[PDB]
C-alpha cells in the first residue's frame, strides 16, 4: 500500500530463507509493491513464482496487476490479463472495467476507452466515483470541454463533495482553451470550501497566496 517495494522484497527473501511457503496474499502484496514503483519485471517474476510454489492467483492479484499496468499505460498487458481472466472464468467486477478504462486513457486510446466504457454500461454494475473520474480525465486529455462540463455538472448533482481530481481536471481543461472566466468562476467557489480543508489549501496555494515560507 505504501509502495515500499524494497522492504517487501527483503521480507519475501527472509521468509523464503526459512523454508516457509509464501501465501497467495503475501505474493499479491509484493506484486502490488513492485508495481507501485513501475518495476513491472519484478512484479511479473513474482506472479510467475506464485504458480511455481502452488500459491494460485486470486482476484486481488489480478486487480493489483491491472492497476499496475494501467498506471503505466501498458494496455497490451491489460488485454492479455483480460484474456487470462476470461479464460479463467472469473467474473469481472467494476475494478476490471475501470482499470481497463484508465489503461486505455493513459495509453492514449480514447476511442477504445469510450468503447470499453459503453461496453461496461451495457452489461451490469454501477460505476463508482472512480469510473466517472477516469472518463472525465480521458475526456479532458482529449480536448473535449463539452463532455467534461456535462459530466461535471451531472456528477456534482449527487451531493458527493466533489474531490480534488475533478477540480484539477477542470482547471486543466479550461486552461487548455484559455477559459480564464471559467477558471475564475470555479476558483471563486473553490477558495472558500467550508466543508473540507484540502480544497481550501490547494485553491489558495495555486493562486500564489501560500508561496511564502510561513504560508507553505
Amino acid at each position: 500500500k505504501g509502495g515500499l517495494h524494497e522492504d517487501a522484497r527483503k521480507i519475501l527473501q527472509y521468509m523464503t530463507a526459512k523454508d516457509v511457503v509464501p501465501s497467495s496474499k503475501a505474493y499479491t502484496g509484493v506484486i502490488e509493491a513492485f508495481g507501485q514503483a513501475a518495476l513491472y519485471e519484478e512484479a511479473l517474476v513474482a506472479f510467475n513464482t506464485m504458480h511455481e510454489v502452488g500459491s494460485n492467483p486470486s482476484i486481488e492479484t489480478f486487480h493489483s496487476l491491472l492497476y499496475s499496468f494501467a498506471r503505466g499505460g501498458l494496455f497490451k498487458e491489460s488485454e492479455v490479463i483480460l484474456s487470462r481472466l476470461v479464460n479463467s472464468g472469473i467474473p469481472r467486477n467494476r475494478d476490471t472495467f475501470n482499470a481497463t478504462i484508465e489503461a486505455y486513457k493513459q495509453g492514449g486510446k480514447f476511442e477504445e476507452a469510450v468503447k470499453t466504457y459503453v461496453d461496461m454500461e451495457k452489461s451490469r454494475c454501477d460505476p463508482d466515483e472512480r469510473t466517472l473520474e477516469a472518463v472525465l480525465s480521458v475526456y479532458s486529455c482529449a480536448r473535449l470541454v463539452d463532455e467534461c462540463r456535462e459530466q461535471f455538472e451531472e456528477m456534482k448533482a449527487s451531493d458527493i463533495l466533489p474531490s480534488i481530481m475533478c477540480y484539477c481536471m477542470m482547471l486543466s481543461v479550461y486552461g487548455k482553451t484559455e477559459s480564464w472566466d471559467d477558471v475564475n468562476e470555479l476558483l471563486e467557489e473553490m477558495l472558500s470550501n467550508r466543508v473540507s480543508n484540502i480544497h481550501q489549501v490547494i485553491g489558495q496555494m495555486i493562486k500564489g497566496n501560500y508561496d511564502d515560507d510561513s504560508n507553505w
Partner: peptide, 17 residues
Amino acid sequence: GTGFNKGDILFYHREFC
C-alpha cells in the same frame, strides 16, 4: 551355463508477452 556369473524450472516462468 545361463546361470554363470549370476546370469520444474522453465515452467510457470515463460515470457509473459
